[PDB]
Amino acid sequence: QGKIFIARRSLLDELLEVDHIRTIYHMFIALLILFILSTLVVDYIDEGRLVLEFSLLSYAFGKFPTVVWTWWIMFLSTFSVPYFLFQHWATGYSKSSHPLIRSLFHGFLFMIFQIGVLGFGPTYVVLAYTLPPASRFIIIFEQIRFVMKAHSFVRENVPRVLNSAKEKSSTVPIPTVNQYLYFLFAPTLIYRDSYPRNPTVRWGYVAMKFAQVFGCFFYVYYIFERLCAPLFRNIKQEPFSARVLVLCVFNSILPGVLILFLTFFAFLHCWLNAFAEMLRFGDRMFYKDWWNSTSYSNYYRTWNVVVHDWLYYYAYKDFLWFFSKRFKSAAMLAVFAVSAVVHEYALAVCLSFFYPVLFVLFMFFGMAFNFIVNDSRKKPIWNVLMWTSLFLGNGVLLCFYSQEWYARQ
Amino acid sequence: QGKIFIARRSLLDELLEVDHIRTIYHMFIALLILFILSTLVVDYIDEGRLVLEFSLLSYAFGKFPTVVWTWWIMFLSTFSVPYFLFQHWATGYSKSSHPLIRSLFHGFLFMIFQIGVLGFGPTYVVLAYTLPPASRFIIIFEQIRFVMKAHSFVRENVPRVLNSAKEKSSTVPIPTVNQYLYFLFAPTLIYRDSYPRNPTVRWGYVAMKFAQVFGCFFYVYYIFERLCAPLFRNIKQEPFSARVLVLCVFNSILPGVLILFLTFFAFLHCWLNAFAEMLRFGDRMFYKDWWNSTSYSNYYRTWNVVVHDWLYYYAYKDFLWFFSKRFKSAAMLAVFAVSAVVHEYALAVCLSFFYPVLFVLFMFFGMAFNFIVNDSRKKPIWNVLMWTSLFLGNGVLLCFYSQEWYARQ
Amino acid sequence: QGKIFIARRSLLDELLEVDHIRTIYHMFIALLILFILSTLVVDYIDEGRLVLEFSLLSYAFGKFPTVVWTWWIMFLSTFSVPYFLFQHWATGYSKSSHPLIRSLFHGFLFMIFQIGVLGFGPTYVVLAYTLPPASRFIIIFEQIRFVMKAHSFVRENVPRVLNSAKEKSSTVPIPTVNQYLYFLFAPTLIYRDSYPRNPTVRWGYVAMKFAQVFGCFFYVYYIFERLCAPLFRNIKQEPFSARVLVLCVFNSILPGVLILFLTFFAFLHCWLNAFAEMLRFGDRMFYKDWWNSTSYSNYYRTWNVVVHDWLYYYAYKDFLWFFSKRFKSAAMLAVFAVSAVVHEYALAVCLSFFYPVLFVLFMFFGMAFNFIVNDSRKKPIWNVLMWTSLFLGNGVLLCFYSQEWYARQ
Amino acid sequence: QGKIFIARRSLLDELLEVDHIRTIYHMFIALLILFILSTLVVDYIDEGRLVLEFSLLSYAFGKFPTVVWTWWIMFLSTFSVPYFLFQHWATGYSKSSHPLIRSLFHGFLFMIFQIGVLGFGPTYVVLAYTLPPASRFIIIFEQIRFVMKAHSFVRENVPRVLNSAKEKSSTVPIPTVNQYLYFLFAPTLIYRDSYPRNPTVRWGYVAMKFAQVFGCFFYVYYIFERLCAPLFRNIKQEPFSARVLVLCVFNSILPGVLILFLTFFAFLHCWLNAFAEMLRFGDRMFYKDWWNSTSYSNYYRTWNVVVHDWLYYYAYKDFLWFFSKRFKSAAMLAVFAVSAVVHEYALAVCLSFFYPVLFVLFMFFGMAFNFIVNDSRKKPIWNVLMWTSLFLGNGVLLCFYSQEWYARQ
Ligand SMILES: CC(C)(COP(=O)(O)OP(=O)(O)OC[C@H]1O[C@@H](n2cnc3c(N)ncnc32)[C@H](O)[C@@H]1OP(=O)(O)O)[C@@H](O)C(=O)NCCC(=O)NCCS
Ligand SMILES: CC(C)(COP(=O)(O)OP(=O)(O)OC[C@H]1O[C@@H](n2cnc3c(N)ncnc32)[C@H](O)[C@@H]1OP(=O)(O)O)[C@@H](O)C(=O)NCCC(=O)NCCS
Ligand SMILES: CC(C)c1cccc(C(C)C)c1NC(=O)NCC1(c2ccc(N(C)C)cc2)CCCC1
Ligand SMILES: CC(C)c1cccc(C(C)C)c1NC(=O)NCC1(c2ccc(N(C)C)cc2)CCCC1
Ligand SMILES: CC(C)CCC[C@@H](C)[C@H]1CC[C@H]2[C@@H]3CC=C4C[C@@H](O)CC[C@]4(C)[C@H]3CC[C@]12C
Ligand SMILES: CC(C)CCC[C@@H](C)[C@H]1CC[C@H]2[C@@H]3CC=C4C[C@@H](O)CC[C@]4(C)[C@H]3CC[C@]12C
Ligand SMILES: CC(C)CCC[C@@H](C)[C@H]1CC[C@H]2[C@@H]3CC=C4C[C@@H](O)CC[C@]4(C)[C@H]3CC[C@]12C
Ligand SMILES: CC(C)CCC[C@@H](C)[C@H]1CC[C@H]2[C@@H]3CC=C4C[C@@H](O)CC[C@]4(C)[C@H]3CC[C@]12C
Structure with missing residues (x-):
C-alpha cells in the first residue's frame, strides 16, 4: 500500500x-x-x-523584501516546529508516561501551530501591509506548500512509531534533520x-x-x-x-x-x-x-x-x-x-x-x-x-x- | 529522371x-x-x-448556376480539344507529311486553345458577368487546374512520339482516352x-x-x-x-x-x-x-x-x-x-x-x-x-x- | 429463372x-x-x-438550377440510404438477434425512405417551388428511376442473405459499393x-x-x-x-x-x-x-x-x-x-x-x-x-x- | 453495244x-x-x-368516252402507220430504185405522221373539247408513250436493213406484226x-x-x-x-x-x-x-x-x-x-x-x-x-x- x-x-x-x-x-x-x-x-x-x-511588474511585484522575510520566518517555523514536536516523541511510547493524554496534547500543539503560524501569519502580512495582487500569490502558494509538507511529515511518520511501540526493547525510528530538510525542497x-x-x-x-x-x-x-x-x-x-x-x-x-x-x-x-x-x-x-x-x-x-x-x-x-x-x-x-x-x-x-x-x-x-x-x-x-x-x-x-x-x- | x-x-x-x-x-x-x-x-x-x-455564404457563394455554367464548358473543352489535337499526330511523324511546319501548326493551335479558351474565356466570364468573391475563386482555381493538366498531357507524350518516330515503321504510342480522363480527375x-x-x-x-x-x-x-x-x-x-x-x-x-x-x-x-x-x-x-x-x-x-x-x-x-x-x-x-x-x-x-x-x-x-x-x-x-x-x-x-x-x- | x-x-x-x-x-x-x-x-x-x-426552351427549361438542386440531393440520398440500410444486415440473420421484428423494422425504414424522400420529396419540390413543364419531367423521370433502382437492389439481394442464413457460420454475401454505384449509372x-x-x-x-x-x-x-x-x-x-x-x-x-x-x-x-x-x-x-x-x-x-x-x-x-x-x-x-x-x-x-x-x-x-x-x-x-x-x-x-x-x- | x-x-x-x-x-x-x-x-x-x-373524281375524270376513242384512234394510227411505212421497205434497198430520194421521202413521211397525228390530234381534243385537268394527263401520257414506241421501232430496225443491204442476194430482216404488237404493250x-x-x-x-x-x-x-x-x-x-x-x-x-x-x-x-x-x-x-x-x-x-x-x-x-x-x-x-x-x-x-x-x-x-x-x-x-x-x-x-x-x- x-x-x-x-x-x-x-x-x-x-x-x-x-x-x-x-x-x-x-x-x-x-x-x-x-x-x-x-x-x-x-x-x-x-x-x-x-x-x-x-512598469507592470514593478506594481505587480511591489514590496518584495517583506515577501522575502515573511517567507524566511515561515520556512524557519515549518522546519523547526514540526520536527522539534516530533523529536519530543523520542521518548514517545517507550516509557509511556500515561498515553492518550500526551498524544492528543502534542496533537493539539501541532494544530495550534498549523493554524496560529500558517493561518494568520501569511494572511496577516498580505492583508495588513497592503501588498499587490501578483506578489500575494507567492506567500499563499508557499503557505499551502509548507502546511502540506508538515501534515505529510506527521501523518506518515506516526504509523512507524505507533507500530514499533508494540515491540518491547527496540530502537525507535526517528527521521534525521538532513533527510527531512531534503524532503522540504523535494518536488x-x-x-x-x-x-x-x-x-x-x-x-x-x-x-x-x-x-x-x-x-x-x-x-x-x-x-x-x-x-x-x-x-x-x-x-x-x-x-x-x-x-x-x-x-x-x-x-x-x-x-x-x-x-x-x-x-x-x-x-x-x-x-x-x-x-x-x-x-x-x-x-x-x-x-x-x-x-x-x-x-x-x-x-x-x-x-x-x-x-x-x-x-x-x-x-x-x-x-x-x-x-x-x-x-x-x-x-x-x-x-x-x-x-x-x-x-x-x-x-x-x-x-x-x-x-x-x-x-x-x-x-x-x-x-x-x-x-x-x-x-x-x-x-x-x-x-x-x-x-x-x-x-x-x-x-x-x-x-x-x-x-x-x-x-x- | x-x-x-x-x-x-x-x-x-x-x-x-x-x-x-x-x-x-x-x-x-x-x-x-x-x-x-x-x-x-x-x-x-x-x-x-x-x-x-x-447570410455571408448567401452573398459569397452568390450566382452559383453561372459557375456550373463555366466549369462544365471548361471541363468539356479541356477534355475534348487537348486530346483531339494530340491524337491528330496519329499520322504524326510516321507518314512525315513535311514535318516541322505541321508540328508548329498544331503547337500554335494548342497555344490558341490555351490562351483563348482557358486564359481569356473564364476570366472574361467572371469580369463581364458580375460575380461575388469566393465564387470567382472556384472558376479561376479550376481554370489553372485544367491549364496545368493540358500542358502536362502534351509535354509528357511528345517525347514518346518523337523517340518512336526516330525508329521508322513502328506502332505509334498514343494514350487511350480512359487514361488522361482518369488523370483529369486524379490528384x-x-x-x-x-x-x-x-x-x-x-x-x-x-x-x-x-x-x-x-x-x-x-x-x-x-x-x-x-x-x-x-x-x-x-x-x-x-x-x-x-x-x-x-x-x-x-x-x-x-x-x-x-x-x-x-x-x-x-x-x-x-x-x-x-x-x-x-x-x-x-x-x-x-x-x-x-x-x-x-x-x-x-x-x-x-x-x-x-x-x-x-x-x-x-x-x-x-x-x-x-x-x-x-x-x-x-x-x-x-x-x-x-x-x-x-x-x-x-x-x-x-x-x-x-x-x-x-x-x-x-x-x-x-x-x-x-x-x-x-x-x-x-x-x-x-x-x-x-x-x-x-x-x-x-x-x-x-x-x-x-x-x-x-x-x- | x-x-x-x-x-x-x-x-x-x-x-x-x-x-x-x-x-x-x-x-x-x-x-x-x-x-x-x-x-x-x-x-x-x-x-x-x-x-x-x-424563346420556347427558355420558358420550358426554366428554373434549371432548382433541378440540379433536386437531382443531386436525390442522387446522394438514393446512393447512401438504400445501401446503408441493407449493409446494416451485416450482422443480419448470422447473429440472429431476435429475427422477424428487426427485419420488418428495416423494411419499414426502407418504406419510409421510399415514400417520404422519393415519393413525397421531389413532387413537393416541383409543386411548392413553381417550375415550368419539360423541367419538372426531369425531376419526376429521375425520381422514378431511383425508386426502381432502390427496389431492384433490395429485392435481388434479400434472397442471397436469407439462403446464406439457412446454412449457419458462413461469409454473408453483401455487394461492395463500386457495384450498385456502377448499377446506379448502368442502363x-x-x-x-x-x-x-x-x-x-x-x-x-x-x-x-x-x-x-x-x-x-x-x-x-x-x-x-x-x-x-x-x-x-x-x-x-x-x-x-x-x-x-x-x-x-x-x-x-x-x-x-x-x-x-x-x-x-x-x-x-x-x-x-x-x-x-x-x-x-x-x-x-x-x-x-x-x-x-x-x-x-x-x-x-x-x-x-x-x-x-x-x-x-x-x-x-x-x-x-x-x-x-x-x-x-x-x-x-x-x-x-x-x-x-x-x-x-x-x-x-x-x-x-x-x-x-x-x-x-x-x-x-x-x-x-x-x-x-x-x-x-x-x-x-x-x-x-x-x-x-x-x-x-x-x-x-x-x-x-x-x-x-x-x-x- | x-x-x-x-x-x-x-x-x-x-x-x-x-x-x-x-x-x-x-x-x-x-x-x-x-x-x-x-x-x-x-x-x-x-x-x-x-x-x-x-364527287371530285367525277369532275376530274369527266368526259371519259372521248378519251377512250381518241386513245383507240391514236393506238390504231401508231400501230398501223409506222409498221406499214417500214413494211414499204420490204423492197427497200434490194432493188435500190434511186436511193437517197426514197430514204428521205419515207423519212419525211414518218415525220409528217409523227407531228400530224400525235402533235395535233391529242392536243386538239383536250384543248377543243374542254376536257378536265386530271383526264387530260392520260391522253398526253399515252401520246408520249406511242411517239417513243414509234421512234424506237424506226431507229433500231433501220440499222438491220442498212447493214444487210450491203450483202447481195440475201433475205432482208423485217419484223412481224405479232412481236411488234407485243412490244407495243411491253414495259x-x-x-x-x-x-x-x-x-x-x-x-x-x-x-x-x-x-x-x-x-x-x-x-x-x-x-x-x-x-x-x-x-x-x-x-x-x-x-x-x-x-x-x-x-x-x-x-x-x-x-x-x-x-x-x-x-x-x-x-x-x-x-x-x-x-x-x-x-x-x-x-x-x-x-x-x-x-x-x-x-x-x-x-x-x-x-x-x-x-x-x-x-x-x-x-x-x-x-x-x-x-x-x-x-x-x-x-x-x-x-x-x-x-x-x-x-x-x-x-x-x-x-x-x-x-x-x-x-x-x-x-x-x-x-x-x-x-x-x-x-x-x-x-x-x-x-x-x-x-x-x-x-x-x-x-x-x-x-x-x-x-x-x-x-x-
Ligand atoms: C524552384 C523551387 C522548386 C525551389 O526548389 P528546387 O528547384 O527544387 O531547388 P534545386 O533542386 O534546383 O537545388 C538543388 C540543390 O539544393 C541542395 N539540396 C539539398 N538537399 C537536396 C535534395 N534532397 N534534393 C535536391 N537538392 C538538394 C543541393 O545543394 C542541391 O545541389 P545540386 O544542384 O547538386 O542538386 C521552388 O522555389 C518552386 O518552384 N516554387 C515555390 C515558389 C513559390 O511558389 N512561392 C510562393 C510564395 S511562398
Ligand atoms: C405484364 C406484361 C409484361 C405482359 O406480358 P407478359 O407478362 O410477359 O405475358 P406472360 O409471359 O405472362 O404470358 C405467357 C403466355 O404468353 C404466350 N407466349 C407466346 N410466346 C411467348 C414467349 N416468347 N414468352 C412467354 N410467353 C409467350 C404463351 O401462351 C405463354 O403461356 P405460358 O403461361 O405457358 O408461359 C406487360 O403488360 C407489362 O408489364 N407492362 C406493359 C403495360 C403498360 O405499361 N402499358 C402502357 C400503355 S401501352
Ligand atoms: C501557401 C502558399 C503561399 C505556397 C507556399 C509554398 C509553395 C506553394 C506552391 C506553389 C508549391 C504555395 N502555393 C500553394 O500551395 N497554392 C495552392 C492553394 C492556394 C492557396 C492560396 C492561394 N491564393 C489565394 C493566392 C491560391 C492557391 C493551397 C491551398 C488551396 C490551393
Ligand atoms: C410508349 C409507352 C406508351 C409504352 C408502351 C409499351 C410499353 C411501355 C413500358 C412501360 C414497358 C411504354 N412506356 C415507356 O416506354 N416509358 C418510358 C419513356 C416514357 C414515355 C412517355 C412518358 N409519358 C409522358 C407518360 C413517360 C416515359 C419512353 C420514352 C422516354 C421514357
Ligand atoms: C515560452 C515558451 C517556450 C513556452 C511554451 C510552452 C510549450 C513548450 C508547451 C505549452 C503547452 C504544451 C502542449 C500542451 C498540449 C499538447 C497536446 C499533446 O497531444 C502533444 C503535446 C502538446 C502540443 C504540448 C507540448 C508543449 C507545449 C506546446
Ligand atoms: C475538424 C476541423 C476543425 C479541421 C481541423 C484540422 C486539423 C486536424 C489540422 C489543422 C492543422 C493541423 C496541424 C498543423 C500543424 C501541426 C504541427 C505538427 O508538428 C504536428 C501536427 C499538427 C498539430 C497538425 C495536426 C492536424 C491539424 C491540427
Ligand atoms: C437524326 C435525327 C433527325 C433523329 C432521327 C432518328 C431516326 C434515325 C429514327 C427515328 C425512327 C426510326 C425508325 C422507326 C421505324 C422503322 C421501321 C423499321 O421497319 C425500319 C427502321 C425504321 C425506319 C427506323 C429507323 C431509324 C429511325 C428513322
Ligand atoms: C396504298 C399503299 C399500299 C401504297 C404504299 C406504297 C409503299 C409500299 C411505298 C411508298 C414509298 C416506298 C419507300 C420509298 C423509300 C424507301 C427507302 C428505302 O431505303 C427502303 C424502302 C422504302 C421504305 C420504300 C418501301 C415501299 C414504300 C413505303
Missing part, C-alpha cells in the same frame, strides 16, 4: 524530441518573439523612446526516507529549464498586457449585459487557453524538473497524459499527481479509513469541498474581494463532471466534450475575475 | 493515429463547437429565434499510364473526409464572423495610420494561422485524399513533413508537392534544358515569376481590385529566404524564424487585403 | 448499316435541315435579323454483380450518339413550333365541338408519329447506348424488333425492355409468387394498374392539371388489345391494326393534352 | 420481304385507313348521310425481237399489284382532298407575300413527299410489274437503288431506267454519234432541254395555263445538280443534300402549281 517510487523520466521531456512536438515548442517561441516585437513597436510609436522597464509530498535518485547532476539541464521558466513568465506577462489589457483596462461605458458579456467571455478564451498551457509547462513540468535535476530526484512522474483522457476520468489524477496523491492518500483514503469502508459519496464531496475551499480562499486573499463563482463552478460542475460521466467511457467524442468544457470554464473564469478586479478601481 | 510513384500514405493520415495528434484534431473540433455555440447565442439574443441562413499533375493503385476502396474513408471538408469549410466561415467581422465590417472613422495598423495586423495574426492550417488540411490533405481514395490512387504524397523543416530551404518542395512537382519538372527543368547548363538564377527567378504572377492573377480577378503587395512580398523576401537561409543549416533556431516569418507574412496578407476590400464601399 | 445477360448489340445499331435504313436516317436529317431553314427564314422576315435565343434495372462487359471503349461512338441526342432534342423542339404552334397557340374563338376536333386530331397525327419515333430513338436507343458505351456494358438489348410485331401481343415486351423486365420480374412474378399459382387476371390488371397510375402521375405533376384520359385509354383499350389479339395470330393484317391504333392513340393523346394545357390561360 | 437484257426480278419486289421494309408498307396502309376514317367522319358530321360517290422501249421471258404467268401476282395500284390511286386522291384541299380551296384574302408563301411551301412538303412516293410505287414499280407478269417479260429492272445515291450521280439513271435508256441510247448517244465524239456539253444541254421541254409541255396542256417555273427549276438546277456535283463523290452527307433538294424542289412545285390552278377560278 501507499505510493511506490520508480526511477522514471518525465513524459513531456522524452516526448519533446519526437520531431513533431518540438515544432509546437518552436511555434510558441515564434509567437513569443512576435508578441515582443508587436509590444515594443506599439510602445515606441505611442511614447518617445522604447520602454526600458516593463513530491509522500515519503521521508530513501527516494529513488539519479547518478549525477547535469547542470546544463537545469540551466535550460530555468531559462524556459523565465521565458514562460515573460510570455504570461505579455499575455495579460496584450490579450487582457486592451478590453479590460479601457471599458467603462453603457454598463449593460446585452451581448457584450458573451463576446467578453468569447474573446477571453484564447488568452485563457495559453494561460492554462503556460501555467502547466512553466510551473508544473519545467520548474519541478529543474529542482528534480538540481537536487537529486528520480521519480519525475508528477503529471500524466491528460491530453487524450476521457473527461475527468483521468484528468483529475493526471493533471497534478503530486497534489492529487496528497489528496488521495491523506484526505480521501484517511477519510475512508476514519469511516472504515463503503461510501463513495460524502467522502468524495469532502475532498472536492476542501479542494475548492483551498482554491477560492487563495484567490480571495490576493485580490481582497470575494465573489467566488469559482466555488460554484468547482462545486456544481466538478461533481457533474465525475458522477454522471464515469471512468469506463471509451468513445473519442468525450475528449472533445472535455476540451469544450475546459476551454469554456477557464474562459469564463479569466473573464469574470479580471472584470471584477478592474471594476473595483 | 522524372517522378517515380510509390504506394504510400499521406504522412498526416499515418501520423493522425499516434494518440497525441488526435488530441489536436479534438482540440480544433472542440473549438468549432464553441465557435458555433458562441455565434448561435449572440444571434439569438441580437435579432430573433436563431440564424436560419448564414497529381505528372504521368498518364499505370499509376500505382490500391487493391480496394473503403468508401467509409471518403465519407469521413468529405464530412471533415464540410466541417472545415464551415470552420473557415465561422472564422470570418467571430474572428474578423468586428474589426473589418465596423471600422470607418478617423482615417489615420497612428497605432491602428500595427494593432490590426497583430489582431489579424491569430485568425491568419487558423486560416492557413484549415486551408492546408481541408483542401491539400482531406479533400485531395478523399478523391485519392474514392478514385483508386496509391501515391498520396501530396505534402511531406514540412512542419519540422529548415526555414525556406525546403518549405517550397514539402508544402504542396503536386504543384511543386509540376513547376520543378515542367517549368524549372525545361528552362534549364532550354538554356542547357549552369545558371541557378534565371531559372530561380523565372519559376518565382511564373508562380507569383499566377497567384496575383488569381487574387486580383476575384475582388476586381489590384494592389499587388502579395507579389512584392513573395518576390523580395521569398528570394532572400531561399538564398540567405540555405539547405545546409540544420539548427532549430531557423525553424523559429520560419514560423515567425509565416505568422507575420500571413497576418500582414489577410489584414491588408481585407482593409482594401472593405475600403471599396 | 431470372434474366440472363448475353453480349449483344442494339438491333437498330446492327440494322442501321444495312444501306437502306441509313437512307431513313438521312431522310430525317434532311427534314431537320429543311425545318431549321424554314423557321430561320420565317423568323428573319417576321421580326429582325434572326432568332438569337429560341438496366436487374442485377448487381458481374454484368457482361465489352473489352474496350470507343469514345468516338459516344460522341456520335450525344451529337444525335443533341440533334433529336432540337428536332423535337422544331416539332413544337412549325408543326404544332400554329394550331394550339392561336385558336381562341367560337368555342364549339363542330368539326374542329376531328380536324385537330387528324392534323395532330402527323406530328405525333414523329414525336413517338424521336422520343424512341433519342432516349431509348441513342442516349441509352451512349451511356452503355461510355460506361462498359455489354448487353444493349434495350428494345427488340417491335416493328414487325403482332398487334399488342408482344408490343409491351419488345418496345422498352429495361422497364418491362423490371415489371415482369419484380411486380408480375412477385404477385404470382404471393398468390402462388393460377390467376392471369389479378396479375395482369395489377401490373397495368401500377404502370398506368405511374404514367398518369408522371404527366399530371408536370402540367399541374389532371384530366386523366390517358389512364382510361391505357386501361380500357390496353386490356382489350392484350386479350382479343393474342400471341397466336401471325397474319400481317394485325400489324396494320397496331399502326392504326398507335397513330390514332398518340394523335388523340397529343391533341387533347395540348388543348387542355393551352386552355388554362 | 446497246442495252442487254438479263432475266432479273425487280429490286423492291425481293426487298419487300426482308421483314423490315414490309413494316413501311403496313404503316402506309394504316395511314390510308386513318385517312379514309377521318374523311368519312368529317363528311358525315358536315352533311346528312355519308358521301356515296367521291420497255429498247428492242423488238426475243425479249427474255419467264416460264409461266402467276395470275395471283398481277391481281395483288392491280389491287395495290387501285389502293395507291385512292391514296393519291385522299392526299389532294385532305392535304391539298383545306389550304388551297379556301384561301382568298389579304393577297400579300409576307410570310404566307414560306408556310404554304413548307406545309406543302409533307403532301409532296407522299405524292412522290405514291407516283413512283403506283405507276413505275407496281403497274409495270403487273403488265410484266401478265404479259410475259423477264427483265423488270426498270428502277434501281436511288435511295442512297449521291445527289444526281445515279438518281438521273436509277429513277426511271426505261425512259432514261430511251434518252441515253436514242437522244444522247445519237446526238454524240451525229457530232462524232468529244463534247460532254451542248449534247448534255440538249438532252436536259428536250426532257424539260417534254415535261413543261405535258403540264401546260392539262391545266391550259403556262407559268413554268418548272422549266427554270429543271434548266438552272438540273444543270447545277450534275456539273458542280460530279459522280465520283462518296461522302454520305451528299445523300442528305440530295434529299433536302428533292424535298424542297417537289414542295415548291406542288405549292406554286396548285396555287396557280385555284388562282384562275
